[PDB]
Amino acid sequence: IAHHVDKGSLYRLGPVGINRLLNKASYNVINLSSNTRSSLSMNSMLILITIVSLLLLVLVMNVNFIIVIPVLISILYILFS
Amino acid sequence: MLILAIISLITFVSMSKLSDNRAIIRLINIYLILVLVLDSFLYLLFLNNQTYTVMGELLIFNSFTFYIDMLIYFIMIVISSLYGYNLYNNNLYKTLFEPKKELIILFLINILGALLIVHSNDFITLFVAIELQSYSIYLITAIYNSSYKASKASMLYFFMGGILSILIAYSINTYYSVLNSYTLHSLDSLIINTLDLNLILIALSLGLLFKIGIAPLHKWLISIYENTPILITIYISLIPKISILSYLVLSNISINSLVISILAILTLLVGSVGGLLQIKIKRLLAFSGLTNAGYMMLLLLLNNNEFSYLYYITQYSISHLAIFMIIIFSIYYINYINNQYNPIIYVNQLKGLIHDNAYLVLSMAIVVFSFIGIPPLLGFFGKLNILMSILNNGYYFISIVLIVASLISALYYLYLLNVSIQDKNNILINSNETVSSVLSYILSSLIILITFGFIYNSLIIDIFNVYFN
Amino acid sequence: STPLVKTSVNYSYGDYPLIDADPHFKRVVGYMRPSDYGVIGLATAALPAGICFAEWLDPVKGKFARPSVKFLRVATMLGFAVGFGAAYARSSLRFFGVTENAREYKKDEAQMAARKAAGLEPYGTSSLTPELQEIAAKNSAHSIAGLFIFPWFNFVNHPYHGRE
Amino acid sequence: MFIGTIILVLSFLGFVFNRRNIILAFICLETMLLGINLILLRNSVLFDDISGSLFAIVIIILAGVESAIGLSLLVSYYRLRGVINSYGI
Amino acid sequence: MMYLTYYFIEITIFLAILCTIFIISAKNPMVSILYMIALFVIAAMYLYLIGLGIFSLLYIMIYIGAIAVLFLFIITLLDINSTELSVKSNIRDLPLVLISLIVLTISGLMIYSNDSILINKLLEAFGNDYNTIITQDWFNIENTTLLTTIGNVLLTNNAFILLVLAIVLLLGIIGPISITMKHK
Amino acid sequence: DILNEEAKIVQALNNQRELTIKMHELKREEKDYAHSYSPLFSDPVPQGGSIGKAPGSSRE
Amino acid sequence: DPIPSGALGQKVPHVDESHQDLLFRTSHMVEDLETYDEDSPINTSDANT
Amino acid sequence: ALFTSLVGASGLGFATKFLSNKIRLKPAGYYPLGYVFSGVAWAGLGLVLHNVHQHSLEVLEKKK
Numbered sequence A: 001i002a003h004h005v006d007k008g009s010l011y012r013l014g015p016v017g018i019n020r021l022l023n024k025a026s027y028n029v030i031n032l033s034s035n036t037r038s039s040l041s042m043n044s045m046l047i048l049i050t051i052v053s054l055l056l057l058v059l060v061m062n063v064n065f066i067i068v069i070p071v072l073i074s075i076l077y078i079l080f081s
Numbered sequence B: 001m002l003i004l005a006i007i008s009l010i011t012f013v014s015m016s017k018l019s020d021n022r023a024i025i026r027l028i029n030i031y032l033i034l035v036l037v038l039d040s041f042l043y044l045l046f047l048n049n050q051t052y053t054v055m056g057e058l059l060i061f062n063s064f065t066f067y068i069d070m071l072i073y074f075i076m077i078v079i080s081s082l083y084g085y086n087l088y089n090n091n092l093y094k095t096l097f098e099p100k101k102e103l104i105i106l107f108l109i110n111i112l113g114a115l116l117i118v119h120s121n122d123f124i125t126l127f128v129a130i131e132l133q134s135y136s137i138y139l140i141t142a143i144y145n146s147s148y149k150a151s152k153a154s155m156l157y158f159f160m161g162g163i164l165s166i167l168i169a170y171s172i173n174t175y176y177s178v179l180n181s182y183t184l185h186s187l188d189s190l191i192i193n194t195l196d197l198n199l200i201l202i203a204l205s206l207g208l209l210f211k212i213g214i215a216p217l218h219k220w221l222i223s224i225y226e227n228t229p230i231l232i233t234i235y236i237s238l239i240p241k242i243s244i245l246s247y248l249v250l251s252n253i254s255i256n257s258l259v260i261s262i263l264a265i266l267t268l269l270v271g272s273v274g275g276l277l278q279i280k281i282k283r284l285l286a287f288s289g290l291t292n293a294g295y296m297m298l299l300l301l302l303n304n305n306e307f308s309y310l311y312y313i314t315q316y317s318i319s320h321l322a323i324f325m326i327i328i329f330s331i332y333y334i335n336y337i338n339n340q341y342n343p344i345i346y347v348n349q350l351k352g353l354i355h356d357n358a359y360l361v362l363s364m365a366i367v368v369f370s371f372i373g374i375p376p377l378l379g380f381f382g383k384l385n386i387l388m389s390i391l392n393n394g395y396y397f398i399s400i401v402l403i404v405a406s407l408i409s410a411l412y413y414l415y416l417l418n419v420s421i422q423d424k425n426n427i428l429i430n431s432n433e434t435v436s437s438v439l440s441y442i443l444s445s446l447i448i449l450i451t452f453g454f455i456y457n458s459l460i461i462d463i464f465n466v467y468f469n
Numbered sequence C: 001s002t003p004l005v006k007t008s009v010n011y012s013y014g015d016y017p018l019i020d021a022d023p024h025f026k027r028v029v030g031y032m033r034p035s036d037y038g039v040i041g042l043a044t045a046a047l048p049a050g051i052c053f054a055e056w057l058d059p060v061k062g063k064f065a066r067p068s069v070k071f072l073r074v075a076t077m078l079g080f081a082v083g084f085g086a087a088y089a090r091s092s093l094r095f096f097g098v099t100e101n102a103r104e105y106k107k108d109e110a111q112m113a114a115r116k117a118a119g120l121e122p123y124g125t126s127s128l129t130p131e132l133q134e135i136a137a138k139n140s141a142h143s144i145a146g147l148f149i150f151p152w153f154n155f156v157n158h159p160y161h162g163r164e
Numbered sequence D: 001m002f003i004g005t006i007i008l009v010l011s012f013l014g015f016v017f018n019r020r021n022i023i024l025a026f027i028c029l030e031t032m033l034l035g036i037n038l039i040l041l042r043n044s045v046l047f048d049d050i051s052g053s054l055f056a057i058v059i060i061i062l063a064g065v066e067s068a069i070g071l072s073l074l075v076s077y078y079r080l081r082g083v084i085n086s087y088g089i
Numbered sequence E: 001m002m003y004l005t006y007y008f009i010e011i012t013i014f015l016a017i018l019c020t021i022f023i024i025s026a027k028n029p030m031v032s033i034l035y036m037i038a039l040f041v042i043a044a045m046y047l048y049l050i051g052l053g054i055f056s057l058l059y060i061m062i063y064i065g066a067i068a069v070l071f072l073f074i075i076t077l078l079d080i081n082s083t084e085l086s087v088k089s090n091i092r093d094l095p096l097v098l099i100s101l102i103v104l105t106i107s108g109l110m111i112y113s114n115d116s117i118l119i120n121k122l123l124e125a126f127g128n129d130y131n132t133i134i135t136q137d138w139f140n141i142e143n144t145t146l147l148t149t150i151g152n153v154l155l156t157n158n159a160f161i162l163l164v165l166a167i168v169l170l171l172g173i174i175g176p177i178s179i180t181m182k183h184k
Numbered sequence F: 001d002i003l004n005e006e007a008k009i010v011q012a013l014n015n016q017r018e019l020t021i022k023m024h025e026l027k028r029e030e031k032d033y034a035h036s037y038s039p040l041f042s043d044p045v046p047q048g049g050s051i052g053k054a055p056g057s058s059r060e
Numbered sequence G: 001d002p003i004p005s006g007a008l009g010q011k012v013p014h015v016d017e018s019h020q021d022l023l024f025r026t027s028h029m030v031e032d033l034e035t036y037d038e039d040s041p042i043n044t045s046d047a048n049t
Numbered sequence H: 001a002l003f004t005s006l007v008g009a010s011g012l013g014f015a016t017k018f019l020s021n022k023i024r025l026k027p028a029g030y031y032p033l034g035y036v037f038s039g040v041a042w043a044g045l046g047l048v049l050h051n052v053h054q055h056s057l058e059v060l061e062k063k064k
């Protein structure tokens, strides 16, 4: 109880697990534009990608909002993981 | 008063030598203060929420816009003090903080652009004001042209802001092509029901919102904030955000927008998580600004947002000024100066600040806990008002995400205080030079506002009930 | 001097009766009280006084020195400008019935009665066409609300003053 | 409105996928503004409405000032480096 | 006549597409600036065709006479490096270019419609199969053209906009001097 | 006395509740065009341009 | 003297004039963690001279 | 009470003067005239706030 639960699972759903999770997530989001050399080209590509993706996402929502939930989950997975 | 100051300043500065710079700034500083205290009484015009259209319906004046104008004046006073007054009188500080000849004019023109954005009743007014503010901000970013990072930042700003200005212009022209109108006043409940304006109005909203750097278009502005001189960064990361957000709050063109909901969630997540691995102070503060922008973005989803927006933007402006001033004050106690534009770069350079200046660290603690939202500091009441607004309107999932983002961003807020209260080996014994009386008084006034402003909460609500109802 | 558009009549901007919704510059200055001139003088003194007091608090060059006469002169001119702006706004708010306006209300009644006796238009004759008078009125009406941003005044003799 | 729309879209794509030089970015900005003005002027003609043409005139003046400032920024950037890289920003 | 003169607008559209492609593909950036000048002449042609020859002349006066001249002046004084269009550098963009082309073009045609159904939104874009009937009346006795009306509204109804534009031009003077001149 | 004091406090609290609900309702009441947009030029109906004014273009 | 940790306790650099070397310019690194400083007074000694 | 409002606002000014002395690494009573000036200024702000609030209450009452 004291090692496997109190200092095992309960720290995993706690400080240790949250620390590991946030470390990977923060690393991924800051490195979203890591290896690129020309900030102008990359940021312009980001604004194009944002616009196009928002248009397609909204088209999906007009079709059926339930179908877009997995897509948003996948996008969050791409960004943070 | 502002236009007059711009004209007079151009003439006077043209006839003045580079050594008069600070003196000139001081003059304008006191001028602004006078305008704030002698012209304040005009608030009476807006009793019972009376609204005035002005300039052939190009401009709109109400209690909301009058308050935003007062806030922008106060911010300009604080920021111009930082150029007009020396922190210390030694050679290093002369090198660190010297105002350029034309900087004060660029600040006043940018303030004019912001105030015109706030009061814009027609789209032609909005576009002219937006381009005025954008062009001024590019020039402000560039005016320290001995710095490689600042010149590169100015180029990046010019191009990204130009693309977003084009998006805004295209939105306005599509609106015109659908309605043969340039004013949102022509929108009625019947028109909104009859026509689909959502794509046009959200395109306008996104064009405005990407200009202050919400996710997923946040990195470019954060880069610009990192790479400008620190006294420029204090100005350019605050004024545009206020002007654009105030205009969107007053326009109410994105109510219950699904797209804005999703982008606000993304902005809160990106701002909280992406601040965690930052080691540079200005990047940390930029991610903080992103998270607080997401908080305010939530208020674009509902009507009757004025009290919570005004409270939040006021306390946030106060806290932003306070934290930048504290960082500036701590420069005197650090071992290593990284360069003349950003004398302090890394959070770790604040290590042991409590042993050099204990009350500076007390000021830091108050500001950090306000950003986190501990009562009875002003930040707590800002967050409380926002939660009341969003839960009154059914945004339950977003309220949970707001709580989670607050908890996450607390970690990088506490990073500053944590390093600042650790031990350092060589501590300060004495020093003959004192930091400036003026700037220390201004910083202390900000700290005292953050600490004790809650005492006036019910009085403030009483006044708000008669000027905004 | 015939209005092209319908205006509100005796509308309440505050707790006092309306005298003039868009008063002429000449009347706004002419109706100023001695207290408004005290405001003008106070600002004219305050700006150079502020520059000297600021010098005293935190000298620009370590050792205190009285600001030169060029800065005192510019401070005096700008202080007069702020003072005149405040005095103009105070008089204007008396014309809107936002502050106390009994003296002004009586004086306006007398002035209008005298002009009517003289056969003149109550608000003067304009060198502009009525359409331009309307556009001028819609540019100047309530422009005092923008005093922080820009100065704008009523210089046109138009009929759109919100009275009976 | 076809010609303006095509000009704007193609200029935007040229700006985004530019990997050649910085002058192309300046040109794509100018031509996106031109496309927007063309769309606006056609709508102004079809409504017989002066508001569109007024906005188009203002757009022209602002494009001039924006060009002046953008090229000043480029020259200030050049002053420290003496060259513009094909990533020069 | 008729065959050519009916499709003058369509020819301007096709030439505009070609000119934009040539702007982006030019080897020498000076040649790119020249193709930009060509695109502006084409835009002036279109504006004349739709009845706005005054805007044709204004565009020639300002965008070619001033802005393109400044462009050339700058590229002449400055040392610019440029790479050529090539598969190694640019074929990687083709998928995104194609998706973005389709999505942006379709959406830019759909933003104009008021129909609830998306397919109808796009269909209205290609829905001008009809001629406008031009009719006469006699109510305008003055000789008022577009330039005169612009002056009339800009100087009276919208005078504030003119004065703010004066401030913007002031910025266009003060700013360049501030960052291109080194004082003292 | 304890009951009287507590009742007075509860009455003041209920007064504050009533005032809050009242301000909430008033803020949501729709205002006149003069109070919300323009108090001097209070007619929403436009006149348009005056140059070639055509008899028969005015429609109520 | 103890190695600085960050907001998550991760390893964080210590910075002084050592990081403005020759082999650490043009380093591949995200702008959030990049320590080379092209405005540093020791890299900008003879600029535009 | 107006007198209590003035005392409280003047105390805010005193706190501002004290904190500014401390941040400058100076003793609490370093330039005691500054306490008077700060207290007077913040009392002026408190008085302005009190008068505006009183007018607001008067207006709310007169619409009844």
Ligand SMILES: CCCCC/C=C/C/C=C\CCCCCCCC(=O)O[C@H](COC(=O)CCCCCCCCCCCCCCC)COP(=O)([O-])OCC[N+](C)(C)C
Pocket (backbone or CB within 6 Å): B036, B037, B038, B040, B041, B043, B063, B066, B067, B070, B071, B074, B306, B307, B310, B311, B314, B315, B378, B449, B452, B453, B454, B456, B460, B463, B464, B467, H009, H012, H042, H045, H046, H048, H049, H052
């Ligand atoms: C003698 C002239 C001095 C006036 C100079 C004012 C400068 C403003 C500079 C900075 C802004 C700081 C916050 C402004 C206070 C709001 C007043 C108000 O009550 O705000 C209300 C609207 O409430 C709101 O929306 C919410 C406001 C959120 C405030 C959040 C911060 C609270 C903590 C402040 C504690 C007060 C300190 C008092 C020290 C004893 C507008 O009131 P009002 O438009 O009727 O104008 C007032 C009459 N006036 C012009 C003469 C002053």
